[PDB]
Amino acid sequence: AEGFVVKDIHFEGLQRVAVGAALLSMPVRTGDTVNDEDISNTIRALFATGNFEDVRVLRDGDTLLVQVKERPTIASITFSGNKSVKDDMLKQNLEASGVRVGESLDRTTIADIEKGLEDFYYSVGKYSASVKAVVTPLPRNRVDLKLVFQEGVS
C-alpha cells in the first residue's frame, strides 16, 4: 500500500530545523507520490546530511513523519561509584544496552541503564546503590555522560 500522495511532512525530533528546510534534504515534496523506496531514499538522504544520528521515515495516513535521533554522539561514558563492579565492565554493559561510544545516543534508554546498573549491583553482593545518568552536551556535536552511583543507600 505504497505510492500514495503525501499531504504534509512532519518531523518527530526536529525542533531547530523546520520541515520546510528539512524538505530540501528530502528527494520528495508535498504532493508527491511516495513509495517505501522513497521512505528509504528520504532516510538515506537525511542520513547522508549528517545532522541527525538516526533517521526513521514512516507514514500515517497521508502524512509522512520523520523521527530523528539526537544530534550529539556518545563520546565518553564516565563512571563514579564503581565500588563493586568494574568501570570497564560497566562500559561494555552500557554498550550492550544501547548507549555505546561512537554510537547515536538515546536519552530515553538512559533510565533503563540506571535501572539496569542498579539491578546488577543488587545481583552481585546485594549492593544497594542508586544510579543516575547525567548527559552533558559539548560543542563538538557529542555528549559526555556520567554515571552517578550513590554508595550505601541500603
Q: Which grid coordinates are listed for 10?
A: 512532519
Helix residue ranges, H only, the chain: 19-22, 36-49, 87-97, 110-125
The method recorded for this entry reads NMR
Spatial separation of the C-alpha atoms in residues 60 and 10, rounded to whole Å? 10
Spatial separation of the C-alpha atoms in residues 29 and 120, rounded to whole Å? 49
Q: Which of 69, 90, 123 is the last residue of a domain?
A: 69
Q: How far is CA 96 from CA 5, 30, 69, 89, 99, in A?
A: 40, 40, 18, 11, 7
| Domain identity same for 64 and 13 | yes
| Domain identity same for 19 and 74 | no
Spatial separation of the C-alpha atoms in residues 149 and 5, rounded to whole Å? 52
| Domain identity same for 58 and 76 | no
Environment class of 119 (CB within 10 Å of its CB; exposed 0-12, middle 13-18, buried 19+): exposed
Q: Which grid coordinates are listed for 38?
A: 522513497
| Domain identity same for 16 and 81 | no
| Domain identity same for 57 and 89 | no
- Total domain count, the chain: 2
Instruction: Specify the CATH number for the domain of residue 62.
Output: 3.10.20.310
| Domain identity same for 80 and 59 | no
| Domain identity same for 11 and 43 | yes
84 three-class SS: coil
| Domain identity same for 86 and 117 | yes
Q: Which of 50, 69, 88 is the last residue of a domain?
A: 69
| Domain identity same for 53 and 86 | no
Instruction: Identify the domain containing residue 46 by its residue range.
Output: 1-69
Place of cell 543516575: 132
Q: Which grid coordinates are listed for 100?
A: 555505546
| Domain identity same for 63 and 77 | no
Q: Is 50 left (phi over 0), alpha (psi -120 to 50) or beta?
A: left
**Roughly what angle, to the nearest 10 degrees, separates helices 87-97 and 110-125?**
130
Q: In angstroms, how far apart are the furthest CA atoms of the chain?
A: 61
Q: Which grid coordinates are listed for 32?
A: 508527491
| Domain identity same for 1 and 62 | yes
Residue (of 135, 10, 7) closest to 73 by Cα position: 135
| Domain identity same for 61 and 84 | no
Q: What is the DSSP string of 7-33?
A: -EEEEES-SSS-HHHHGGGSS--TT-E
102 three-class SS: coil
Spatial separation of the C-alpha atoms in residues 37 and 60, rounded to whole Å? 16
